[PDB]
Design an enzyme around this catalytic site. Structure first.
Site, PDB file in Angstrom:
ATOM      1  N   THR F   1       0.862  -1.206   0.000  1.00  0.00           N
ATOM      2  CA  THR F   1       0.000   0.000   0.000  1.00  0.00           C
ATOM      3  C   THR F   1       0.886   1.239   0.000  1.00  0.00           C
ATOM      4  O   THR F   1       1.931   1.276   0.653  1.00  0.00           O
ATOM      5  CB  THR F   1      -0.896   0.068   1.249  1.00  0.00           C
ATOM      6  OG1 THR F   1      -1.934  -0.894   1.083  1.00  0.00           O
ATOM      7  CG2 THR F   1      -1.487   1.454   1.488  1.00  0.00           C
ATOM      8  N   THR F   2       0.411   2.267  -0.665  1.00  0.00           N
ATOM      9  CA  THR F   2       1.018   3.560  -0.523  1.00  0.00           C
ATOM     10  C   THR F   2      -0.065   4.636  -0.625  1.00  0.00           C
ATOM     11  O   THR F   2      -0.873   4.623  -1.543  1.00  0.00           O
ATOM     12  CB  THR F   2       2.083   3.774  -1.609  1.00  0.00           C
ATOM     13  OG1 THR F   2       2.884   2.606  -1.797  1.00  0.00           O
ATOM     14  CG2 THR F   2       2.955   4.971  -1.261  1.00  0.00           C
ATOM     15  N   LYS F  33      -8.978   3.210  -2.102  1.00  0.00           N
ATOM     16  CA  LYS F  33      -8.332   3.440  -0.812  1.00  0.00           C
ATOM     17  C   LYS F  33      -8.567   4.861  -0.350  1.00  0.00           C
ATOM     18  O   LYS F  33      -8.096   5.252   0.686  1.00  0.00           O
ATOM     19  CB  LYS F  33      -6.837   3.127  -0.841  1.00  0.00           C
ATOM     20  CG  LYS F  33      -6.524   1.650  -1.012  1.00  0.00           C
ATOM     21  CD  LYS F  33      -5.059   1.358  -1.016  1.00  0.00           C
ATOM     22  CE  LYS F  33      -4.744  -0.059  -1.461  1.00  0.00           C
ATOM     23  NZ  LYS F  33      -3.278  -0.303  -1.409  1.00  0.00           N
TER      24      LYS F  33
END
Lengths: 208, 206, 204, 219, 218, 201, 228, 228, 206
Positions: F1-2, F33
């Site tokens: 994830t970023t 997200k």
């Protein structure tokens, strides 16, 4: 003694512009053995347009099916006799799974049905209830085979189907899974869901 | 001990300093968080620990002190009474279900006469506390990995009659030695003085 | 797991007088990527290609030992080694470390120059072989690869058709795997020639 | 794995299934599990594949040396002793279970060897993860002085119990018949798991895959 | 920790058979060889279990009282299907409080000219089929009964009894904690009867079992 | 994830990738997200998907009740405080969560970080997730207060791209949002593999 | 496992059951646990099959060599001493309880016990295995010195039947061998002709009353046999 | 501990040893393990002394109340059921094997066994404790139904003596009580008059030959008794 | 990962940098240790790890390379051959009794023609290695907690045709970002260039 057992097997679904097709295998596995080759507990009808499909521990999907059936009955008594939509049931399911965060159901679930526009939809969940809407899905012991194949034939990123052609692709995916996964086999029950109604069909697989 | 805090009292003031660092494992998120919090007009507390416990502990102390103020005609509470209440909240938590508040504090204040009937000795006070509920009045004190270096310096250089200018110089030497010798980076300090006129930021220290 | 630390995957398929063998290009340290240009294939002679997956230090050490034994074989025997004898040699070198193993999993493909018969082998890390007539696979996306090949492979493909099937299997499986990717390299081997191609894939 | 043997009137019949697994996946649908030891002696193996393979190859080579030295046919008791001594030295770390059968001048001989190095000479045996299911057919079907045909039908029925009831066994039956004069291997003696629905063919048009570069070499 | 061994059952054309041995063991010790392990429930049903005998007794006493009372107080006679459902919800509830019922059950009955057979395990897994077993019966007997049910038409009562005895014979040869003393229950015509104990015939005299051939040193 | 977010003169930019991975198998390449809490506030998820999605939905419910009872919008400081009290009360129960909360209220644009232990911090720039350790490299090189909206969107997009190219747990589609005085807008969605072809020159 | 050896006037009888098991499954129902060490000396083996087979074979090898070097038949005490030494030197890596017994013309019939740990004790009878615990009292009540060879065979058959009717880890055939100055006499009794089992004892024919029918009285009578 | 109860024609006999121990030291050599629950109903206790004393006392309290409320003497089956319920509800926190036995005019003499785990079984005889394992075979060989009261007392005394001669955790006195329609009859046998022990059995008088003198022969004869 | 090392190659050079820190738990002992060691006239290796293993490993490589030099008429060995020998020593140690050398290296060199018969392609080379014996030729590479930040920067800014001045600037931005974002203090860097003229210190980087 553990409170958990994995009973094995596989489910898959594919949505179309105005149908969805859903399949589950019928074998119930024990430890180093087979209890029966004709279990029908993986698919469970919730309304005339919506199904639950589950893999993992069979005793936990039996509990979850009954808890959902009773919340849906209360919804009709509090809403004038009317049934909830596929999207409403999908959000209810997410919320029920997260409320058991601290002793979770050992289940991999899908909700599939028609949306309001009449198109197919599949929601897949992790065991505490995160999900998203998608056009196809699979879970269980053969899911790491079937899923890359569906990516290949349906999205074609490295390169509209009929009900009939979609059902043939799933027949071929289950036949392949039965040859290479030791816990999947014997038969598949398929349901085809349309606005009219629900057609069913049984399909034989290898017995070893 | 990833954050260092320092304090010392002289004849008409207490100086208090603390490092700005907020980290997530080995990554610096920011280095300018103010951890020297003002509790009332003449009191501050400097706390070392994770953000969650630190913030929830100082807001609980601030709330109870504000309540106690208005059921008392808005009179400034003495520093020893605030210290006693904090110690009792730390020790209470240690034997509770949720567990100890993992914070280490230095509390500093300047006491001022309530009225003409008040026979309190006016002056600055400084209390060292730990997360278990230990509490001791001290002339100077520190928490964190840097503590041992600074304490030895102050044993060598501190006197009670330092002027304000000599004290600001002495606090800058203490902060520089933390930067020189501690592996964990503590690059910015924030410092405040407590005096008979209240609480002020000292801008020449960093 | 020690076998998944470095990344990478390999596949080989058989056809009519030909084979294709394919690897991914990634080299990592768990989730960190060091390089995107590290194929895992080694050409042994005109008839044989070896693919090695597992821990990268043991891929480099084990392939150097194999190249050293092969050089001495040619001077003693005055001939190139054939595929069945090469796999037996590799199995014997792995079993010698039975109780302190090399963390590698070899895939071997060969074609007998004379007859046109193709031979495939895959081994576990202590040397047990399996010699099917269709395909072999190993590495981090082995479970997905194994299922893609069962669906797409069929008997009696020629070089160009067999190439298409192997590339699609490798790219679909790598897209479901965090530890293998950045495209692929393939060798296509017949009695007469050896072709090599670089396949474009995703960049994540 | 399911492996089985019986003694009949003039010989031994060995049997095996052909599935190999890693975890819950079928790696090979036609693995051979019946290994050559000598012209009059065969072995089936369960256990760690590499260990089973290594042990049987080593003893097969030492029996061949001993036939050239002495000039005489190999005895099944010698094979049995050599296997047992090797397995005992490694204290179970070399995890091979074996069914050994053959025929020599003292008649038919059948035995098992466990991984810790213990042996048992008997008239019917089974080993592997399907061994309990297979042994249920042997105890219901075995009798003294079977003909060759009765013995092949009994071994094939014991292997099919493993194939249908044990998840780690599958695909088909291989047999091996061993008489005084000859050894006959019958791969695919019974195939009760054919294709039900024919494989759909998925054609990819040539040129489908994007390529960046190409090198060629003539041989 | 008295415990019972294997149980096996099979449906035939017109009824269902259930079989087990009369023994309770404590570890390896064979402590009581004359124990009736099958229990009648209401009018149509019989049950048996493998595992902890005290937990089998608590559970069956509780179900039998519920069935007799519901009938005496005017709510009808429960069917085998309903009894089975009720058993399964009790086992799952105990699993969910970490106080499990450490048994595996087999239930058989006959109601409406229709035979019932099913199993429940100690986490609450449930299934129904033409043959069911618990203990070593699951590894030893199911392979034989599944082969007998392959013939088209189904089994007669006589064929069903014969294959049940072959299974009991193998359990006595190959299950350590066993004796040669068995009972059979038959549910047919909307009732259950339990037979007297009997023994099976066994073979010990093969030439290959003789003292000379089995010797380790010759 | 970023995930990352920063505050510049023209508001707040947020940007994310779209992969969900255990640590080997990739369960999806199309997770959203960024959570649209309501029409004046955004959240982001990292850590456990289920925990972030459930508790952000709870927070959206609390914001709407505030609006019904008080006839005005809740501030960003209060919204973030409601979420940090929840995580603090469950600090011994094993949540995994690393959220940002962003909005524009009467004191202007505000950006907070909130984690699973009750942490709550206000600052001009954050990155969160396993890819954060690559995104901070590019972002600290290009960030200043005086960026135009177009430059700020590009900087955010290029930073998530470089994380996706090196971190195995990040990939998929890069999405950019802009939080301004009139609420918020979705600026763009781009596959990270199309972006590679535009930046390799 | 149940093993034993008993002395009589002018020799010994050894006896055993025939079962080998992994705990709850029977791998061999017809093992032979009486192993020959020399013409008139045998051992009984309990514990790990692999360990006892290996040490018996080694002891036998050494006795054959000794017998060739002296040109005379060996004494029981020599076999016991060799076997003891192997059990004691390897005690941490094996599971073995041995009984050595036999006939020689110097000392007649002799019995030696070598339990776990590697001690060596010379006795009139010895018991070993899981089943031995059931037989201490049977011998304390019913064994006498000076039995004849036929008395002693019959006694040991009965003793083995009692132990295996109560011990789940024993069962199957009873094997015996009698060693004296004449030729060795082996015998195998099948389960169907065993001299004792619970299944045919008349005091265990009638079933306990565990399942009484629903009644208007607290009197306990019979088990329910048919549905109401 | 060795406990038992046996039915006879018109009643029961209970019997026990008297030793309580911490493993290898004897804390009490004269305990009483036959505990009264009502005039003609007793239990035998094995396992933790603390747990069995506490559950016997509670069971007795409940039977006394029941008897006052009905104005009649209680049946053995009621005592067994109450005791079973306490053993089963507390099974994870106790160490207890119980035997309940007694006489009532409805069912005559009855014996119930309640082993660890809390099951309840109605039998003709029951054995319990560490020493029981030595007696399964003694009863299989020598017990019959229909013994008289005096036969049955004598049989149980002998059975207890055999178990305690082999079991280190049993010893001391033998206590018995006989329950029938007449008055209860208790008896205590001291160790000095025990009907069996190894120390006085003539087949164990002569010592094994473990320490033979240094000699010029391999013949084994006698133990050395004096220095050379 | 308490010490960060960085390297990158462009058309006629390789730059190599490493942090100076030596620590004992949380105390900085010194911050000026040189960890970029010269192996011969045109080669350097930068190593990260504890002093004991680092020094014993580079002295072993230096000794074997000097021996090999004089049994070869003093000719400069190629960079790929030195890399191959190092990898073989790291992998050897991993399966030895004493265990692995816990060091992570970057090896850089500039190859130059031996004689007129030499048909070697002249040029700069850079190899990444790890403590297990993994070895890969790369255009740029890093070890330590700072590695991930710098790699992403270089993916964004590196080109093969950087001039010497542009490269020194780019190396200073890389070192500054390690100081900005890593909690463990890496305050001084030492940097060296490898070129066709040999090895030189770059003084303008720190």
């Amino acid at each position: 003694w553990s409170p958990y057992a994995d009973n094995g097997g596989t489910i898959a679904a594919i949505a179309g512009k105005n149908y969805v097709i859903l399949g589950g295998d019928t074998r119930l596995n024990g430890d180093f053995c087979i209890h029966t080759r004709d279990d029908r507990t993986k698919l469970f009808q919730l309304t005339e347009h919506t199904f639950l499909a589950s893999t993992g521990m069979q005793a936990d999907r039996l509990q979850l099916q009954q808890m959902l059936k009773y919340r849906i009955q209360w919804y009709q008594y509090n809403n004038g006799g009317k049934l909830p939509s596929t999207k409403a049931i999908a959000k209810l399911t997410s919320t029920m799974l997260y409320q058991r965060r601290f002793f979770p159901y050992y289940t991999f679930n899908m909700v599939v049905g028609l949306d309001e526009k009449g198109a197919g939809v599949c929601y897949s969940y992790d065991p505490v209830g995160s999900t998203e809407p998608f056009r196809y899905g699979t879970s269980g012991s053969a899911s790491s085979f079937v899923e890359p194949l569906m990516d290949c034939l349906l999205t074609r990123q490295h390169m509209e189907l009929s009900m009939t052609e979609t059902l043939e692709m799933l027949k071929n995916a289950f036949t392949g899974a039965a040859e290479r996964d030791i816990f999947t086999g014997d038969a598949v029950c398929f349901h085809i869901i349309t606005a009219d109604g629900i057609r069913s069909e049984l399909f034989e697989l290898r017995n070893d | 001990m990833s954050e260092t805090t320092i304090a010392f009292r002289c004849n008409g003031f207490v100086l208090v300093a603390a490092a700005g660092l907020n980290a997530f494992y080995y990554i610096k998120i920011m280095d300018t968080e103010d951890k020297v919090t003002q509790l009332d007009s003449h009191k501050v507390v400097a706390c070392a620990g994770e953000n969650g416990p630190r913030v929830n502990f100082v807001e609980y102390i601030k709330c109870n002190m504000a309540l106690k103020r208005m059921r008392e005609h808005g009179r400034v509470i003495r520093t020893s009474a605030a210290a006693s209440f904090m110690r009792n909240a730390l020790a209470g938590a240690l034997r509770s279900r949720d567990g100890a508040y993992l914070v280490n504090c230095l509390l500093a204040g300047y006491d001022v006469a309530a009225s003409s009937d008040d026979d309190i000795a006016t002056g600055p006070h400084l209390y060292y506390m730990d997360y278990l509920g230990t509490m001791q009045e001290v002339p100077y004190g520190c928490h964190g990995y840097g503590a041992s270096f600074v304490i030895a310096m102050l044993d060598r250089l501190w006197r009670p009659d330092l002027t304000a200018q000599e004290a600001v110089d002495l606090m800058q030497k203490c902060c520089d030695e933390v930067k020189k010798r501690v592996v964990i980076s503590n690059d910015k300090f924030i410092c405040k003085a407590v005096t008979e006129n209240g609480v002020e930021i000292v801008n020449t220290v960093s | 797991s020690i076998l998944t630390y470095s990344g990478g995957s390999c596949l080989a398929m058989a056809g009519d007088g030909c084979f294709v063998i394919v690897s991914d290009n990634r080299l990592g340290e768990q989730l960190k990527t060091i390089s995107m240009e590290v194929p895992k294939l080694h050409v042994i002679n005109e008839s044989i290609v070896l693919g090695l997956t597992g821990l990268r230090t043991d891929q480099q050490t084990f392939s150097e030992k194999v190249r050293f034994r092969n050089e001495l074989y040619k001077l003693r025997e005055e001939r190139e080694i054939g595929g069945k004898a090469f796999a037996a040699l590799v199995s014997s070198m792995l079993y010698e470390a039975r109780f302190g193993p090399w963390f590698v999993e070899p895939v071997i493909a060969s074609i007998d120059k004379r007859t046109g018969e193709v031979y495939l082998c895959a081994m576990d890390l202590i040397g047990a072989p399996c010699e099917p007539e269709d395909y072999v696979c190993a590495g981090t996306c082995a479970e997905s690869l194994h299922g893609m090949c069962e669906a797409l492979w069929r008997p009696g493909l020629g070089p160009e058709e067999l190439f298409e099937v192997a590339a699609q299997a490798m790219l679909s499986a790598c897209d479901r795997d965090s530890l293998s990717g950045y495209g692929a390299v393939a060798a296509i081997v017949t009695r007469d020639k050896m072709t090599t191609r670089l396949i474009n894939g995703r960049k994540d | 794995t399911t492996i089985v043997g019986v003694v009949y009137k003039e010989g031994v019949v060995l049997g095996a299934d052909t599935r190999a697994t890693e975890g819950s996946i079928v790696a090979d649908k036609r693995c051979k599990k019946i290994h050559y030891m000598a012209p009059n002696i065969m072995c089936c193996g369960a256990g760690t594949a590499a260990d089973t393979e290594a042990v049987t190859n080593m003893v097969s080579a030492n029996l061949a040396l001993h036939r050239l030295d002495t000039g005489k046919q190999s005895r099944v008791h010698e094979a049995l002793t050599m296997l047992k001594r090797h397995l005992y030295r490694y204290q179970g770390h070399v995890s091979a279970a074996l069914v050994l059968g053959g025929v020599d001048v003292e008649g038919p001989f059948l035995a098992t060897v466990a991984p810790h190095g213990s042996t048992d000479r008997l008239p019917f045996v089974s080993m592997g993860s399907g061994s309990i299911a297979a042994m249920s057919a042997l105890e219901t079907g075995y009798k003294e002085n079977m003909t060759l045909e009765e013995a092949k039908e009994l071994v094939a029925s014991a292997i099919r119990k493993g194939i249908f009831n044990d998840p780690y066994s599958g695909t088909q039956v291989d047999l091996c018949v061993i008489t005084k004069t000859k050894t006959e291997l019958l791969i695919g003696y019974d195939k009760p798991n054919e294709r039900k629905y024919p494989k759909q063919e998925i054609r990819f048009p040539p040129g489908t895959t994007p390529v960046l570069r190409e090198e060629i070499r003539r041989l | 920790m008295a415990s019972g061994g294997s149980v096996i059952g099979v449906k035939y054309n017109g009824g269902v058979l259930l079989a087990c041995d009369t023994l309770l063991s404590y570890g390896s010790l064979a402590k009581w060889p004359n124990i009736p392990r099958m229990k009648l429930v209401g009018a149509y049903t019989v049950m048996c279990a493998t595992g902890d005998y005290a937990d089998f007794q608590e559970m069956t006493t509780m179900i039998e009282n519920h069935v007799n009372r519901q009938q005496m107080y005017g709510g009808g006679a429960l069917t085998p299907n309903e009894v089975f459902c009720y058993l399964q919800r009790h086992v799952y509830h105990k699993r969910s409080q970490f106080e499990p019922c450490l048994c595996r059950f087999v239930v058989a009955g006959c109601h409406g000219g229709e035979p019932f057979l099913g199993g429940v395990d100690d986490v609450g897994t449930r299934w129904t089929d033409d043959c069911v077993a618990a203990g070593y019966g699951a590894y030893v007997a199911l392979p034989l009964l599944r082969q007998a049910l392959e013939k088209p038409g189904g089994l007669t009562r006589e064929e069903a009894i014969r294959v049940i005895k072959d299974c009991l014979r193998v359990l006595f040869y190959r299950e350590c904690r066993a004796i040669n003393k068995f009972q059979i229950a038959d549910a047919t015509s909307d009732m259950v009867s339990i037979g007297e104990p009997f023994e099976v015939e066994t073979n010990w005299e093969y030439d290959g079992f003789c003292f000379e051939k089995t010797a380790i040193i010759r | 994830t970023t995930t990352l977010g920063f505050h510049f003169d023209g508001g707040i930019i947020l940007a994310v990738d779209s992969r969900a991975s255990s640590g080997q198998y990739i369960s999806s390449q199309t997770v959203m997200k960024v959570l649209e809490i309501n029409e004046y506030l955004l959240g982001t998820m990292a850590g456990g998907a289920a925990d972030c999605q459930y508790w952000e939905r709870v927070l959206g419910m609390e914001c709407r009740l505030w609006e019904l009872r008080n006839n005005c919008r809740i501030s960003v400081a209060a919204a973030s405080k409601i979420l940090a009290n929840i995580t603090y009360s469950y600090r011994n129960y094993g949540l995994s969560m690393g959220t940002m909360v962003a909005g524009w209220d009467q004191f202007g644009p505000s950006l907070y970080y909130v984690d699973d232990k009750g942490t709550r911090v206000k600052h001009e720039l954050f990155s969160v997730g396993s890819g954060s350790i690559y995104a901070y490299g590019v972002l600290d090189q290009g960030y200043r207060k005086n960026l135009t909206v177009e430059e700020a969107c590009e900087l955010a997009r290029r930073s998530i791209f470089h994380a996706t190219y090196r971190d195995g747990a990040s990939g998929g589609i890069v999405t950019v949002y802009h939080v301004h005085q009139g609420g918020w807008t979705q600026i763009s969605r781009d596959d990270q593999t199309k972006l590679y072809d535009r930046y390799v020159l | 496992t149940t093993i034993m050896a008993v002395a009589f006037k002018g020799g010994v009888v050894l006896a055993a059951d025939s079962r080998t098991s992994t705990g709850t499954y029977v791998v061999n129902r017809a093992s032979n646990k009486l192993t020959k060490l020399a013409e008139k000396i045998y051992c009984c083996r309990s514990g790990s099959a692999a360990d006892t087979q290996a040490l018996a074979e080694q002891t036998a090898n050494y006795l054959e060599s000794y017998e060739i070097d002296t040109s005379k038949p060996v004494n029981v005490t020599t076999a016991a001493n060799i076997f003891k030494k192997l059990c004691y030197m390897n005690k941490w890596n094996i599971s073995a309880g041995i009984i050595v017994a036999g006939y020689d013309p110097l000392n007649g019939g002799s019995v030696y016990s070598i339990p776990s740990g590697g001690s060596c004790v010379k006795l009139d009878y010895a018991l070993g295995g899981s089943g031995s615990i059931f037989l201490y009292s049977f011998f304390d009540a019913n064994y006498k010195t000076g039995m004849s060879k036929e008395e002693c065979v019959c006694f040991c058959q009965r003793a083995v039947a009692h132990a295996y009717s109560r011990d789940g880890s024993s069962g199957g055939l009873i094997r015996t061998i009698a060693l004296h100055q004449g030729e060795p006499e082996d015998m195998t009794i099948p389960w169907t002709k065993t001299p004792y089992c619970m299944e045919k004892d008349p005091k265990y024919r009638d079933l306990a009353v565990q399942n009484p029918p629903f009644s208007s009285s607290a009197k306990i009578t019979v088990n329910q046999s048919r549905s109401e």
